[PDB]
A paper describes a structure:
It is suitable for monitoring ligand binding events as well as conformational changes of main and side chains.
Our spitrobot-2 cryo-trapping data clearly show that structural snapshots of the binding event can be obtained at delay times (1 s) inaccessible by manual methods. In addition to indole binding, we clearly observe a conformational change in the backbone of the F-helix of T4L in the indole-bound states, which is shifted by about 1.8 Å compared to the apo state.
Numbering used by the authors: 1 to 163
The structure:
Amino acid sequence: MNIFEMLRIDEGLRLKIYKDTEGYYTIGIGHLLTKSPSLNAAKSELDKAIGRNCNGVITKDEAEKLFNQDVDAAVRGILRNAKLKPVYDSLDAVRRAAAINMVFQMGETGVAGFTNSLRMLQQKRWDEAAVNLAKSRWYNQTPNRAKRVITTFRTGTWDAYNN
């Protein structure tokens, strides 16, 4: 297990534009295209991202390319964020993957807003952190996914992903 396999489990793989859990146009492995309700706007973003006229459909190789970029972008987001970087630097590799997962799903700004959880994580108060993390819109809207990510922070194991 690693961050790629983890996110592939959490996000799935779809080769045609679909709507994510928030109703937003998405493709591939959780590649958000736009928050606009315009399918045409989403198709335009897709064509810009892939570099050809795709008419809403991509290949598996293209999906994996966008995914690799998106994982890289999440890590970059963390390292450039003054709230996230000290916590990330404090974590072991397994828990780092949990943090990347969160940023992938919610964005850098959104995760930087989990001030109290981040402090508990930095303190290595894992059970406390896990309780605090679940007091969130995130948990309430995507509870099975959030439970997996929280288990990963709580235990520093991949036990929630041995599917």
